[PDB]
């Protein structure tokens, strides 16, 4: 099982906690600058960026199946920073949450 694959694998499991390459590297027992080394090498991008594309495409579709709160939502989705949730919404869906809400449910 190469590296890549168990972080891969680790973020479908863990994605709503608290996660960046220092407690990965923590969890894993690897050097955290090389695991976002190795990351952006197989990947073609950052973690971070990574895994931002994989919590907003959870946080699309909860806001679409459920009318519970936005920010509950961004909760579930792995975010505590309601700014850094906003700004990383619209990079990834190329809309606000509360308007890509109303497009959609």
């Known amino acids: 099982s190469p590296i890549i694959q168990n972080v ?5 499991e863990h994605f709503s906690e608290g996660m960046s ?3 990965l590297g ?4 690897i050097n955290a600058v090389y695991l976002g080394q190795l990351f952006q090498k197989e990947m073609g991008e950052h973690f971070t ?3 931002n594309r994989y919590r907003v495409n959870y946080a699309k579709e909860e806001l679409l199946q459920t009318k519970d709160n936005l920010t509950i939502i961004a909760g579930k989705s ?3 920073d309601m700014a850094y949730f906003y700004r990383q919404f619209k990079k990834h869906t190329g809309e606000t949450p509360n308007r890509y809400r109303k497009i959609h449910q």
């Open 78 to 80: 792995g975010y505590t």
């Open 8 to 12: 891969l694998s680790y973020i479908t």
């Open 26 to 29: 923590n969890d894993f027992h």
């Open 49 to 51: 960026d990574y895994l």
């Open 21 to 23: 390459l220092k407690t």
